Design a protein around this nucleic acid. Sequence first.
RNA 1: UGGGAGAGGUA
Lengths: 49, 49, 75, 248, 149, 1327, 100
Amino acid sequence: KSDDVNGRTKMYKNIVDGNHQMEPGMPESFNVLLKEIRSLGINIELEDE
Amino acid sequence: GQNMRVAFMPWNGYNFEDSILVSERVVQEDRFTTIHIQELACVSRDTKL
Amino acid sequence: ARVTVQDAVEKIGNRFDLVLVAARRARQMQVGGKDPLVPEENDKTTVIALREIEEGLINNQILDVRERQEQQEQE
Amino acid sequence: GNRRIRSVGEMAENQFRVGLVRVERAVKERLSLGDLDTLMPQDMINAKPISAAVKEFFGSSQLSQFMDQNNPLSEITHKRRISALGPGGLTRERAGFEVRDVHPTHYGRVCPIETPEGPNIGLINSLSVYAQTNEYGFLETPYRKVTDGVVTDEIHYLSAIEEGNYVIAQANSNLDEEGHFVEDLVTCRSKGESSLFSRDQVDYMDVSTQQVVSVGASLIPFLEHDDANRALMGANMQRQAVPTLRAD
Amino acid sequence: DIVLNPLGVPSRMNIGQILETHLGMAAKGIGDKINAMLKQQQEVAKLREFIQRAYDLGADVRQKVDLSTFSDEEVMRLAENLRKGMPIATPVFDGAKEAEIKELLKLGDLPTSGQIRLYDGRTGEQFERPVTVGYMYMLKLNHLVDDKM
Amino acid sequence: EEFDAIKIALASPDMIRSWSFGEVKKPETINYRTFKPERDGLFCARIFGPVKDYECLCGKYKRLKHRGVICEKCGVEVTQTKVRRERMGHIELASPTAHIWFLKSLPSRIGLLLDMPLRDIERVLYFESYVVIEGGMTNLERQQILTEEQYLDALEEFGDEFDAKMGAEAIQALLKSMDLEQECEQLREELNETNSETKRKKLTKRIKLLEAFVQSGNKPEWMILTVLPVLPPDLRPLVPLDGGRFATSDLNDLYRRVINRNNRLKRLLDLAAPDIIVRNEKRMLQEAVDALLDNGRRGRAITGSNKRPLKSLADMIKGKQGRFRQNLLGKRVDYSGRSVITVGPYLRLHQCGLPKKMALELFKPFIYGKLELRGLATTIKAAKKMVEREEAVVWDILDEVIREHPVLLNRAPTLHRLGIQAFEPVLIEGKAIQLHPLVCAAYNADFDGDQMAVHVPLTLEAQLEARALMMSTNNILSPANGEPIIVPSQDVVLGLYYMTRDCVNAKGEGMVLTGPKEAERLYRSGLASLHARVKVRITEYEKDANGELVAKTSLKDTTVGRAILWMIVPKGLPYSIVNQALGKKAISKMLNTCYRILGLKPTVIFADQIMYTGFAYAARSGASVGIDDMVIPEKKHEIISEAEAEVAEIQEQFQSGLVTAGERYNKVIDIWAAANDRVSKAMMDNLQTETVINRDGQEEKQVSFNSIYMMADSGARGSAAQIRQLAGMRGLMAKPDGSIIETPITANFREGLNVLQYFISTHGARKGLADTALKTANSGYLTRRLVDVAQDLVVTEDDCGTHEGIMMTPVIEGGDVKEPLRDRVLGRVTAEDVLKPGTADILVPRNTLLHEQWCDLLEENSVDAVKVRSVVSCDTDFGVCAHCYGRDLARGHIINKGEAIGVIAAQSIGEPGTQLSIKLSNVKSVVNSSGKLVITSRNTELKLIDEFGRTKESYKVPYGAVLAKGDGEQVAGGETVANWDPHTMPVITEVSGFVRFTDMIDGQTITRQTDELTGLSSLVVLDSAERTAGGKDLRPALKIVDAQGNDVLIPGTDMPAQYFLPGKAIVQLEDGVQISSGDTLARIPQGGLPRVADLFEARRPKEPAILAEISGIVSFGKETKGKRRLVITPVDGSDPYEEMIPKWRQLNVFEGERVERGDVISDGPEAPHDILRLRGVHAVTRYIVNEVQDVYRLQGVKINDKHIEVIVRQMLRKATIVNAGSSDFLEGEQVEYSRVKIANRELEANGKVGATYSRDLLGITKASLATESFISAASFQETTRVLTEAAVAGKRDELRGLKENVIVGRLIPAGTGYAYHQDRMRRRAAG
Amino acid sequence: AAFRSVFPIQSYSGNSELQYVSYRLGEPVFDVQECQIRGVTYSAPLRVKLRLVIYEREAPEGTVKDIKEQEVYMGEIPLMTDNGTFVINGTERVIVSQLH
RNA sequence: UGGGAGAGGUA
Ligand SMILES: [Mg+2]
Ligand SMILES: [Zn+2]
Ligand SMILES: [Zn+2]
């Protein structure tokens, strides 16, 4: 219901398809936050496992 | 405002916590009917195209 | 359980996995099209699933053995 | 007596002076080095800084407010309003409880039951009905001078510090035959506090019984039977009333 | 016209609500009697006598109105403007007492205690206690559900 | 997109070049004639991607068929324009510049690294002075700052040998040249010979910084930027306004300034510029980069056009309006709307009235889905026109969709969790939501313009979560206490009170009725009244031992109304709950009784029927408010005139001058207080029994039927003080500073105040009215701090299996019990079995949840105290177990696992912030010669035991007091049997003999003078300040001796009883008199929400009660100092441990006593740091819990104590190492207590030494900032400092908590996400 | 007062100075309803007579060399209507008094 | 489109 773009498009077409189920992902404000802490010269990254 | 015939009594929970029950004659006689004038504008601008 | 779900909580034991198993049964009725074991009474699939849980026809291990026997009869 | 009133004419005079020195510097610089025979005053006086400063003030100062125009009481209470904030005044976030209280010198100059009920509560006030200003800007309120017990019809506007010396009678004290008080132990207020006094000691009397309250707080009937927390909200909520189809 | 809640009064202590209700009941009673005389088309002397009696009614009030100087067309015009209720001034901290409110209620042939016996609208039965009925002055604030919704 | 950590570190220049997509080289954003970006500008399409979706810039490649294609005419690749918010650039700086965070975010991270002053570092970076880097000669040492004169003379002197530079390049050369391992070895060997504590703490700071660097792998020169990254252009957009003019982007302005000054520095460096111009340009570039990173930090803030300071990247991260606190911890939301609420009194408990237009807008994709599934709409334009035209088939589809689809209803501020509740909507015509009248107490929602927000949940998981967790028929009880929140409010209460009242001769009394249906028929036909006493045949069901209901019918003596209410009381309850005049407390106890006996669904149906019958019969009552119903007592003028005569008498006494102004003011305050309470009692009597006039035999009195009294007495609305101000007297109104005015307001609101009385009352009116605003600000801030300290606390286990716990005793402080044991223990779990001989020798086993009947078992056996487990003593690391928390108070049964008890605890504490025989213990006492028990120990208190074995009374006996009675005997109650000296404390000896004035000189040790008012020669002792030359090394000791002169002896010890007495101890007795055993010798004279905040922030008071450290003999330390010094000599150990005591601080214990660890030696409020350090965890929990519950019990607020224990457990999470074990925890550094316990667990597993720790009570803010997760710490507070320390240390958040999984966006480890998170744990562990 | 606070003004040396003579206010171009319709402020032209003299520094006291007195236009000031309000850009504002 | 200030208001 918020800043997850693929999740909200898929949620709209899943509701119209009659299948009330979401597949969520990363909110875009978190990527905004990652790019701003990176633009402060500080390497922050989602460590994969 | 207008002078309203007012009775002080609880009426079936329809004036429960600072609520007000109003007769339909106040809506028929158009006592608290207000006029709300609203201005919309349309500007014709010089687009470079 | 169109009013309250305390009877279905008394059936299972824990509201959180009650929500999860009712969600899985409601997905099997909404997506999969499997038969509601309780009569429908023109209801949404979530209330049909909660009615089935409160009646005591399905559980977590009952749903697991049901989908396992479907996987065995197909594959 | 330590807080004066800086009104619209004084504020626009100061912004005009700021624009005038901002252009006076440049015209003195031009008169220093320019030619002399053909130098008119017109091409060296520039109307840009003065008009820019006074238009900036009148359009977007913190005290140039879009007027409330719900009913006539809204506009008249806006036009008789007193703001502690703005350029040179306080700030809303860092004001304590001491500036947001009813000082005893507000009797007749500032209303104690008309103010907003949010984070703006003691910082926005309302002028009382009979309140004036001095030539210096201090608030003053009228009193009837009593002489030898005879309460006359002579009216003196006493400022905030002058009334702190005398004993001033209450407006709810009884008079007869255009004479004197009907009792001996008469209530009064002096030097902040308010205690009982004799009927000959008194120096002044309030000019009316509605001298304390503002304009909007003096439209409430039976205000004296109201709690002040609800009278405040009634005086506030009268200014939000829409005008209806037929007046009544 | 409006049914308010009585449980909002004794916690917030705004008794000017109740006193304005009683004085409005008295004022509307005077307006009802003037409207009855005007609808029956009685006389100019009856109207002058009754309006004068309603005017010089208070205890030791400062207003002295006298319809002897009022010509008959002005008394008919005044009764026409008063036929919807006589307006009543009441200065702040210089009000009307409950004795003067009850005196105006006794002039208007209304109950002195301020309360009449109301009947139920739907069942037709009667409320078991007398209910305070009068004429408050209501305003319509600018927080409308057309703008909030 | 799977990940299990978030890792932060410093950024290499090659790392920034690896994120980069091309160098920004020119400061232009866009062309302004044609809105196209410039080549290599700040908005360039060749670097940052194309502008249109799937186009190039020149428009040659327009279609998606060239999906990724680098064009030839422009060079911008055609792709999505989604890449303009992912592709960063870089700027190659022409000279190195320092990062502002690692220079100014204190501690400075470079002055902590090189051990240099920040003034010297800034003087180097500001091009004001040189600094040498390497000295080939011995004359110059490293990190020595030279002025320019010294630099020139050393440059002509040594020629070429040394090399000193200036600016950020010098500091980068220093950080490149330093050697971290050799510096760490040098500082570690320096820490051995370090005896100075300030050098030790500074050295541990520097050593931990060096060790963090060498364990993270960051090079230390990366704190000096050489490449500068550039934010992507869709994260700093150009927003055109309406008038063809773009709006000011502050990040674009700061980036443009950096590019301009960098290009000018490149041109100056190429042009072989003079050194003054080059140094000025480098200084301007350094300050421009520092402004871009954090504008208002180093110098003045660089302003924009409107004289505001520009926003920078640190401003975009930090603050309440920052990215974290405004877009990650809470955000705007689709499928949501708002409107004004009204009453729906026709609804059930699970229904809300939702408008048609609102639900039609919120539910539009569901309507499209059902339009496709029913076939009425084939094209999307047809479905759009069908929903837009609002056809009747569309309304039928909407009624089908709304059906069994809960919506969430929320009202700001959400102070606790019952401000979001799920309802099933009813579609009503209108524009206002219709809230049910019983949930308005939970929402705090009256109907004077409150608005509420609807939130539609979409998935089946969300719908079932709303149905099974957040439905309004699941939230019957509070989580804070156990009390129900679905309580009738004022109109239900007035109706049920008026239904169950009684009269004496009403109508048809004394009839005998067949039952409730006949009573209803009688009242509805009108043959009887609602209050007439009748004889009703009543059948009631009671539960057996098994869960069945048997009936027993009788004839009761009721009214008609109680019979009518029995028709809605369900089967199972007795009749005694309906047989009285029901007020608010009786109605809520009826609902609670029905709940505990029957369950959830009968309580829901009973609350709805209660609401309908109360509303209908209050409508039938007609209870109005009139001006005659506020009856003034006739005796008011008499009491007022009598108090006027009394104040005239006291004023006449002041005219006579025998009384002063202070005693006159106090006496007139007592006079008007007595007059006010007398007129209030007279008013209340004449109001509450005004219906004496009755009939059928006589005039028989009864409870009144006055309207104002019925509203006050039913608990509906009003209280004694408000009815007092309505009818009796207004009272004593206070000045704005808090002083009381000597004349009160003597008129009520019926008569009406005058001008002066209204102006007096406006002071207190505006005081309360401003107090509400400032208190809701402070309450919101405190609730935020509490939630952020206790967010991650989840029940993760089932039983830790420990034997610690807290001994819950009934609070008996004062002369009364405050909370009994049943309320203090109902719902806990016993840490041990009950073991008393007692009355019956009860044994309840360990680990049992104390139910209601178990609490009645404790009542009937009169048990005194019981040790139960708490969350502060749970042995589960990373959470608590279910058995150390006990009962889930919102549900009643034991708590499940996966519950956010910390969020529940913090909301429960921060929600009412807007409402803000004889027995002796510690017996060290002797008897005098008069047979009375004098007391010589300060920490003694008396406990009146009772016959049942409890302590129903306790008092603290003062020091210097004397006890009349003894111990163990039956004490005649009703009087404090001991007597004390309340003003001056005497210096009582316990040994007899004749006094000789030895170890003193009358004239030198004391000031030899008679006392000035009595004439008799006294011994006034002058203090140590004004002593003689021989007074600075000795003190006067009143050595009580025998009749001839030998010193008497302490019995049991060898100490010859000479008593050193301090100054201001006026000895009236002379020599030669006999001193007894138990007599004296001299005399020595003597907001609530901020209190809750100060107790939770662990703030030390300014004058702490100084506490004795150990057990031993207290003496005095080094004398002749301004601060008097104290040392305690132990009987076994060594303690020269001194303490500075200020000038105006007294002493409670003298220099010749035996004190123990934790003994108070100065009066004052205690400090919880000291309480923890000297008395332990259970002591500091009991202190904080009782000190917070004091305020909450004062303002009538009932909160359980496990919530405060949860917060204290979250405060106590830190342990400092004092003796190192075998792990790498050195000394005196704060480590996490759970990790220390895990390390000691594995050390006793593998058989090693183990570590010795000490708990550290931190405040809420310090604990929530020192948590081991930089995302939670940064999203709470001090984002600059938290991200700086975390980036230097190279941490990683493991996303273990609720805030981290909310920010990143996964399921929280609580509730229905606990299963998925432990699934992920077993996957990434067993993998 | 604002004109006398800054006038007169000498040079960097003293060879010329600017004297203020008198000010006046012209008639407004539009009435209040016209400004509220057109969306322009309700103002007035400020016309002030100035005097420019030149000190002959080649002379010991060269008082009179060149006397200019023309009408100067120093911006605009928005007038207050007959109710106490100002019309600024067509909208109606109120300058609230301050208590400092 | 959609950003930032300032002012006032509602609970
Ligand atoms: Mg409200
Ligand atoms: Zn191209
Ligand atoms: Zn354990």
